[PDB]
Structure 1
Amino acid sequence: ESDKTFPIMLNGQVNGYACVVGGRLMKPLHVEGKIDNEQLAAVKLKKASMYDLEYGDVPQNMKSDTLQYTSDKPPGFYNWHHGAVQYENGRFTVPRGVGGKGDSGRPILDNRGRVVAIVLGGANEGTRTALSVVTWNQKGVTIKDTPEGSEPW
């Protein structure tokens, strides 16, 4: 379940997604186009180009509905939209070539029903797909991660 998430409609194309985390709407900056919900679109997002992300306070009518971000990231399998993804050696890893362009902004879900990260894209070394993701250090510092030769989706 992840209905508290919203894709961006560009020319009627789901070129990306966005998630309301901690009462702030976050979408990839690279994902061109307008968000689905008109009330969310009224938010004048603030960009953070180093993260390829833009953020802004969701309006006062749905900040209660926000997903809870998750600091803890123990090694294991994490829920997604395309089933679930493994997290290994500090990076989310996914079956080779599953998922791709348009999946940016899809949140990754803690089995407890919380969001641990938002995906930007991926890469393949040849054995497995490695994902690029925004993350949070144990301290709580928000970070972006991008494997070698990362491709945004």
Structure 2
Amino acid sequence: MCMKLESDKTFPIMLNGQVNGYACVVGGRLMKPLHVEGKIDNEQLAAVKLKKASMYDLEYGDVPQNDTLQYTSDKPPGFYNWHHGAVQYENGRFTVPRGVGGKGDSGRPILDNRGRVVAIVLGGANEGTRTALSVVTWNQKGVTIKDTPEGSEPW
């Protein structure tokens, strides 16, 4: 379901072997997290460098395509999907259970219930039972906010 939408859309980042993060091509903009490093696949992205923003722990740029996931400035709380499980938006927090996560879960996108990406996760909190996550979101004016879950641990 979500895998079909993210098929040839989420690009693994090779850390000399295994993967450390996923890059997301959305809205004509490439996306990749700073805090985890490695080798991006699909060398049409590797040939171009991506201008940085360390305050959002991220770096962005343009897209060499002859890939256009839309923006959601408004997210009803409800529940949304991501390719490890379901998430709920609780007045400023995104929620996942105990065991889901792990190191290397950074850079994953979270979509809405039908396909539009709403945010991208870069880490989480150390607790569980639908605990908060280190996520980069967009407000009603299309402005970037790094939501702080008081976790400081980037899964």
Task: State the TM-score, normalized to the length of structure 2.
Answer: 0.89
Identical aligned residues as a percent: 100
TM-superposition CA deviations, 1:44-79 (whole Å, max 9, x none): 101100000001101133xxx222122111101111
Measured in 2, the distance between the counterparts of 1:152 and 1:143 equals 16
Contact 1:96 1:128 in 2 (8 A): yes
Q: Secondary structure at the match of 1:38?
A: coil
CA 1:2–1:115: 2 relative to 1, 3 Å: farther
Q: Secondary structure at the match of 1:60?
A: coil
After superposition, the CA RMSD in angstroms is: 1.5
CA 1:5–1:85: 2 relative to 1, 3 Å: same
TM-superposition CA deviations, 1:94-116 (whole Å, max 9, x none): 01231121110000011120100
Measured in 2, the distance between the counterparts of 1:69 and 1:12 equals 33
2:3 corresponding residue in structure 1: none
Contact 1:4 1:66 in 2 (8 A): no
Structure 2, gaps ≥5 residues long: 1-5
Contact 2:29 2:62 in 1 (8 A): yes
Quote how far apart the aligned CAs of 1:41 are.
Answer: 1.0
Q: Secondary structure at the match of 1:50?
A: coil
Contact 2:34 2:57 in 1 (8 A): yes
1:31 corresponding residue in structure 2: 36
More strand by share: 1
Contact 2:29 2:61 in 1 (8 A): yes
Q: Secondary structure at the match of 2:55?
A: helix
CA 1:2–1:146: 2 relative to 1, 3 Å: farther
Bigger mean CA offset, 84-93 vs 47-56? 84-93
Quote how far apart the aligned CAs of 1:13 are.
Answer: 1.3
CA 1:77–1:16: 2 relative to 1, 3 Å: same
Structure 1, gaps ≥5 residues long: none
1:86 corresponding residue in structure 2: 88
Measured in 1, the distance between the counterparts of 2:59 and 2:91 equals 27
Contact 1:76 1:86 in 2 (8 A): yes
CA 1:66–1:12: 2 relative to 1, 3 Å: farther
Measured in 2, the distance between the counterparts of 1:131 and 1:49 equals 18
Measured in 2, the distance between the counterparts of 1:126 and 1:110 equals 22
Bigger mean CA offset, 101-110 vs 117-126? 117-126
